[PDB]
Design a protein around this nucleic acid. Sequence first.
DNA 1: CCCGAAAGTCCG
DNA 2: CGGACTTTCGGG
Length: 231
Amino acid sequence: VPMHPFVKALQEHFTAHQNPEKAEPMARYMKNHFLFLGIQTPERRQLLKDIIQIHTLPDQKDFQIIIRELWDLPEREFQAAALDIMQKYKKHINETHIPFLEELIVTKSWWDSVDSIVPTFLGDIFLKHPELISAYIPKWIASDNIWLQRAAILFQLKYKQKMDEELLFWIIGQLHSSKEFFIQKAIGWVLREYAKTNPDVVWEYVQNNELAPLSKREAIKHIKQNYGINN
DNA sequence: CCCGAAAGTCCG
DNA sequence: CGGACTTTCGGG
């Protein structure tokens, strides 16, 4: 069965505008886990737009198929484009897509893809269906996969006043001993971000609970100005 | 334009 | 460890 024509067209059009000179530092930035064509986001967005203008966005029946086929291509720009395309199908994504999103998180995994899946797509789903959080988050924390663990930490990133504080701090407690940079840093990020909404609660938490040095430092990067640094 | 964010390197 | 600095991207 041939590649979906929309995906074939995108592959052809991206490849015709590849930049091997830029591809080398772009690949180094992601610690050489992926090949790159060398196309940065503004042009990549336009090249996708070109193909949508010519071919139209595929019928929603093929949405998951398109994403998978792009996910399976070697160069990282195709996963970046896949996430752009998923946003165009946003209104069609719901709680039944959580396993599909899980599988994107644990394949071709790195911070660039995972951070574009978790606080937005999964965040929105669990905001609407908070009763489903306990069907997934305990498994993610217990798994060997650091990107599912990072997903558990960051899905509430943008919740602001809708943050479930007890849940957030419980998740962080489960993962606070991790020696993995991407877990320590995710903990720092979500605390720093939530501190923009509720600085008193984050300050109390970090002064009175164990965290990796990196996590605490990142958490209070801004709010330490509000409370001061004791001698 | 600006600022803040994932990262990243380089150094003491 | 953590500070100083780097580009790229999202967003006000």
